Paper text:
TFIIF is involved in the recruitment of RNA Pol II and the association with Mediator, whereas TFIID is responsible for binding to the promoter. The YEATS domain of Taf14 recognizes acylated lysine 9 of histone H3 (H3K9acyl), and the ET domain is capable of associating with the hxhKh motif found in several co-activators, such as Sth1 and Taf213. Here, we determined the molecular and structural basis by which the YEATS and ET domains of Taf14 bind to the C-terminal tail of Taf2 and identified a unique DNA-binding activity of the linker region connecting the two domains.
To gain insight into the binding mechanism, we crystallized the Taf14ET-Taf2CT complex and determined its structure to 1.7 Å by X-ray crystallography. Characteristic β-sheet interactions are observed between the backbone amides of V1397, I1399 and T1401 of Taf2CT and G218, F220 and I222 of Taf14ET. The side chains of V1397 and I1399 of Taf2CT are oriented toward and essentially buried in the hydrophobic groove of Taf14ET. The complex is further stabilized by a set of additional hydrogen bonds formed between the backbone amide group of F1395 of Taf2CT and the side chain carboxyl group and the backbone amino group of D223 of Taf14ET. The side chain amino group of K1398 of Taf2CT donates a transient hydrogen bond to the side chain carboxyl moiety of E219 of Taf14ET, whereas the guanidino moiety of R1400 of Taf2CT is hydrogen bonded to the backbone carbonyl group of K1398. In the Taf14ET-Taf2CT complex, the only lysine residue of Taf2CT, K1398, is in the middle of the β-strand and thus its position is fixed.
Residue numbers in the entry:
A (entry chain D): 1392 to 1401
B (entry chain C): 168 to 241
C (entry chain A): 171 to 241
D (entry chain B): 1393 to 1401
The structure:
């Protein structure tokens, strides 16, 4: 359904 | 519609995550990991140094705690 | 980054350890404590607080190896 | 000069 992807990187 | 859940602006939360100091960013990873439920989509690629999260998969209470933490530490 | 170890990657990796495997990190750091290391074990509070920059390079490498092996 | 990590139970 709804999604909000966040890629937290070093 | 995908940018707000439980009255938490997820894009604003994501912008705030970028401003955290590196040691306070680890605290966000800890808060997510310590409260993980199966419905939460969380991937920690350890050797690559990337922590991938679907913010819409998180429960409203955890999103509110993450947003409070991000405001407190930026 | 200190030595060959990315401290942020090490910290991210420490978060992925299971609770029983975290005990091995506390053991490894405590067993290798030097004065220059900043390490606090608040036992009654259940907190183990470390400055990763204060750790010697050999210990950081063994910690990183442990984290890769147990995640 | 510091990178503080807090491991908590």
């Amino acid at each position: 359904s709804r999604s909000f992807m966040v890629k937290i990187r070093t | 519609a995908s940018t707000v859940k439980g009255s938490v602006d997820l894009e604003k939360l994501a912008f705030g995550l970028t401003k955290l100091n590196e040691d306070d960013l680890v605290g966000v990873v800890q808060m997510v990991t310590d409260n993980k439920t199966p419905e939460m989509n969380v991937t920690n690629n350890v050797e690559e140094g990337e922590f991938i999260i679907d913010l819409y998969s998180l429960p409203e209470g955890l999103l509110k705690s993450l947003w409070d933490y991000v405001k407190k530490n930026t």
